[PDB]
Write a protein that binds this ligand. Sequence first.
Ligand SMILES: O=C(O)[C@H]1O[C@@H](O)[C@H](O)[C@@H](O)[C@@H]1O
Length: 242
Amino acid sequence: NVISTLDLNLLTKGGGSWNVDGVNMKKSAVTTFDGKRVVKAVYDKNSGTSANPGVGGFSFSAVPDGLNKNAITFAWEVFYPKGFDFARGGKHGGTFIGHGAASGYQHSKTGASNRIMWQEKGGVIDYIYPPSDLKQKIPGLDPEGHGIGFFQDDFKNALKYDVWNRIEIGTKMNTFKNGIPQLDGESYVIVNGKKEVLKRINWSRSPDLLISRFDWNTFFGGPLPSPKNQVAYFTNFQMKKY
Ligand SMILES: O=C(O)[C@H]1O[C@@H](O)[C@H](O)[C@@H](O)[C@@H]1O
């Protein structure tokens, strides 16, 4: 079900068919590790958001050829060396819907996002920013404050040390009936083969606002930055059928 795979040797020169831009490698770099072509994600002590002075992580945006605007999954693998301190969470990346803000305490009427976060002790959650001024029925899915977490009980200590963890995040748009969003959008998260699904989401307010891009932006927190200088390795970035 893999549609295409990102060539990391093209990450900083347009990404090939992935149509990559918005790149900020920061202190991170494409390299070889464990016989694989990887990004070594460098997270300085006291790095996290712009509130934190350390440099950590890396970011890029992709609009790959073959991006199905109605439903799509993105997948990657991550290696955490033994001793990595996961702190109280951080971001990997995910799918953005529509246009406008949908991250960093900013919401917009036209935009939304579906992202993977890690958690304490290697937990994983689905982390969603829903659009402003759009009905939801899922409890707690409000476009106020920061993003809304799901599957907290479901992936405790799912990310293991000294192994390639496999992560996937699936996003499927709601339908529309006479331009009215139908509260039937979906999200799923897969970590090392275990899948959890969230249904009944309003991902956007109109049928023109659909899945728009893959946004990668890995960093600690907020609000707690990296406790120490440390690294993780990311590889095998895939775009897959929902
Ligand atoms: O408040 C939420 O839904 C989530 O917010 C994130 O920032 C936290 O890392 C996570 O532990 C929460 O469950």
